[model samples]
Target: GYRVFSANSTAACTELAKRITERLGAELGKSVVYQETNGETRVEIKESVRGQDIFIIQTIPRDVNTAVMELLIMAYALKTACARNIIGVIPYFPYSKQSKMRKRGSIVCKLLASMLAKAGLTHIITMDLHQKEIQGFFSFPVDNLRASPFLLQYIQEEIPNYRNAVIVAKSPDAAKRAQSYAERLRLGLAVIHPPITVVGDVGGRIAIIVDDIIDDVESFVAAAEILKERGAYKIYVMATHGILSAEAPRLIEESSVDEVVVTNTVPHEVQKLQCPKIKTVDISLILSEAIRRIHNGESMAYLFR
Candidate 1:
């Protein structure tokens, strides 16, 4: 028997599951159950699973520890229920940013990999991991999906004169990915390495800062200020996950950035009505297609288009 179950974190995913079922001609049930523990949620399969191939959809954006626990519990439940295969669909893999230990007392990204492997997950599917090496942490088969195509398509459809606009990737690390996006859009590409101190004249131009995730908004604010100092007329930021925390909306509103673009990988209810410059793009369709491909034995790589 084949089954698709989504972890109960947000109701938006329920709608996504419905669309997936409709598109793939598959059945989806809310069997992956979770409960609040010490104010944290942990997920587990509620029903019997004698012989099943299961796909568990869970996104770890904000509450990293709780979300990870939920994934672990779900994996354990499926394994305990005698399920033949368990594939974890984590759109935003937590702790991916800490891929390397820059300092001596730092926890390596390998620790995150070991945790997932210990959870008995047979396969893993994630999107826009901070580093490619994080995938090596998994002992089982892993598929890392990219959100660049969806973001690029959105830019072409929504933003006018996208061809004339310059694509600015935030850091040197993001240069390669940003260049790819710029090439696809047939736009100019530049990288912004924000200076630490002011030493020269400042002017204004339009810059778009792209990253895989956004958590506290400090980096975004700092980058925006630097861009403004460098004579950037307008600063626009884009990230896949909107892990808004510590007054992120207020930070962005007060910063020099004119706009911030984020995907619906994680919910942003506060900013929906509060922040005017924050724009959210829904990538649920992209995720649904990835899920369908994995279940149908198709090339997950095709999702890049």
Candidate 2:
């Protein structure tokens, strides 16, 4: 039972706010306000957040720089207003690919963490960061929620007959997390190597490829091709965020993937179209639960489970 506010560089915050208000009703209180950031160029905050527990929701995907700046400005606004706490819900954390500094002149993930800490973020809740080690960037508590629960449940309900299907983790990075999804579904697991060239020969078996994110559909299409070559009957690609950039739909349409499942952490217009293969799971309820838990001083472990 606390006040909630959302800000973003684009229309994402508005959509999220609408869903939250719809789901939580009076429990979520009122949204301070909604503002757009420079016609989708810069970041903006429209609410009066003085002495409030502010939660800013936005996903930094393609336009990373502008979105980051918008978040920084909102954080400063909240701090200046004497807000009790500023929690950030960035469903897709950009620059997560730079989590490691295995080479010289590399920007370490610690720097990103330090920047947010300095920006006055009390805490951060994000989903399926490209690198798990990116959590080390923050000094404050960071809740790295997984998208597998919803994805697994969907598979169980939609494709139950494929219970004996083999689950394939798309990347070695993703394989570490795919185990839990595979186990929950009571299926065998395997890891597909990189440099997937084209569609191969997957015959009668079913294949489920699990990953944390999907931006462009190139790698995914190639992976589908590889799975097809290996005799996979129906190939399902699941991820947390569907950035769907650069001819993603075209690639998906041209590929062997049977379906693409993603969470509605980011807003996409194409999701509404009549595409039988594309399905989205709304995580707004899950996010609302997390916000409630944080306000009530409850552990968020259940979110991950």
Candidate 3:
């Protein structure tokens, strides 16, 4: 009973919305969550969503400020439209790294969560979060979906002899995710703490650097060097979001990393073309199934299967 819509911020996610509608036997609602030249967000819904379940999918990317505002405005409009349920399907939840109060700074993640709730978001769905505790920042229901199944399937099918690979986390915060991949793929999990910095014993093994997002290539470049020095047979990088900022592509090209794997959580088609080392996996298939299950009130546990 749910229909899918997209904001201008996530206009690149058209295929995802299209697939979800097809999966649910529903048509995608025509929406114009556009931004004006004066940096203002405007939402224009072509159809009435009153008493109808409406789902909005948007990813907060590099242009996060505008992206966040556009989604908020769209959701607020839907709420006022008398929609029965307004679910925010944020593929990449923004401000996740600011979940904790470090120093005298504001916890933006908490504030954003509260903002969405106040904006009348009934529920939220997102992929592997930068910090899992973000769910607690919200009083409304939140679904934390794992991107491992998609990543692992890609590794197994695409990478040669992935069984010999070792999952390495960029930080301790992402170590648990690496361990999940290790257990799932029956590979050994390696820890690389860039902070206290331990290259660990990844000697002669396929090193897989895992993280939720890859913002720049500086840390990854250093890690690649460390892995090479540690006698790693090959180095691979995996992340949910590929925010290749600046000359990250050039950095990756010059680095010793063998392959970089990521999902289409954000619009990475241009990045994929810009970086020869970059490879992308589709998240639409899993998300479409999740949408279908949510629409029918069916258990979503089967998504991992």
Candidate 4:
């Protein structure tokens, strides 16, 4: 039997789980129940999951710490129940930005990975991990799916006159990612250095800034202003994850950028309602497809294509 459930019941997670179950063509009945204990959390499965494959869908919510704790507790519950397999589907991995060690700081990503493995997670399916090397932190197979195909398809099908657009990297560090998009779409590439130098001119062309994540919009706003100063006719900001911190909606609304595009890996409906420029691209198809493939023991390499 296939048990697909979500620990964090946010609309994003619920919507994603519904899509996954829909794709699997398998209807599920209520099962696990979560309870609070002394300001902590615990999970109790209502029915037997023995010899069943369990897929837990957990995405970070506004209460980030609680969400993580819930996922760990849920996984531990399934582990103690003797499930045949425990696969964690975390679209936007929490604390991914803290993968590396800093002065007087800990490698939280590794710590979380260890904790998840210790809790008996046999596999993991995540999308657009903040850092590619974060997978190395896990002992089990970690499938880091890409949301680029969905985003790129959106650019081709939705963006009007994309041929007149230039892919701009917000900084030199992102030039490689920008170049990949430029080559794939056969568009001109430009990098926004501190002074905004390098590559094709943006004068009279639509500038599209690409990044892995869009959290604080300050840099994006400043980059759009620079593109405008360089004679860009219009601007678009696209990323895989749209964390869109508290002030992001206001800042983006006041920016010169025309549109802010991101995948639904992170929920931003509230921010979207506050700012019309914010747009979301549903990547649930990719996530659902990945879940289906994993359940059937199919090769995951093709998903990258």
The prediction achieving the highest lDDT against the true structure is: 4
Give a tens-digit lDDT track for model 2, residues 108-192: 5577667776879999988877777778778998888877777778888887576767778776666777787878878788776
* TM-score of every model versus the real structure: 0.86, 0.86, 0.93, 0.94
Candidate 4 error regions (>4 Å): 11-13, 32-38, 194-200
RMSD of 2: 3.5
Q: How much lDDT does each candidate structure score? A: 0.71, 0.72, 0.80, 0.84
Instruction: For residue 292, give model 3's deviation from the true position in Å.
Output: 1.3
Residue 31 miss distance in model 2 (angstroms): 8.8
Number of the top TM-score candidate: 4
Off by over 4 Å in 1: 10-27, 32-44, 106-108, 197-205
Kindly provide the TM-score of model 2 when superposed on the true structure, using C-alpha atoms.
0.86
Ranking by TM-score: 4, 3, 1, 2
Q: After superposition, how far is residue 61 of candidate 3 from its true place, in Å?
A: 3.3
**Candidate 1 lDDT tens digits, 1-305:** 34777764666545545555666677775564556555756655667777777888776545567767777777887788887788887777777777777877554567867776677788887778787777787888887888787677767776655554667766678787777776777766776663443222334335666788888788678767876777767677878877777688887778888877888776676665577788888776776777777767778657755
Output the better candidate (2/4) by lDDT. Answer: 4
Candidate 4, position 304, lDDT = 83
Question: Can you write out model 4's per-residue Cα lDDT over 1-305, one digit (the tens) per residue?
Answer: 46887786454546666766787776643555455566667666777887888899886757788888888888888899898899999998988888879999999999999999988999999998877889999999989999889889988887888899999998876787788899999999998875556456899999999998898898899899989988998898989988888789999888899999998887787889999898899887888888888888888888886
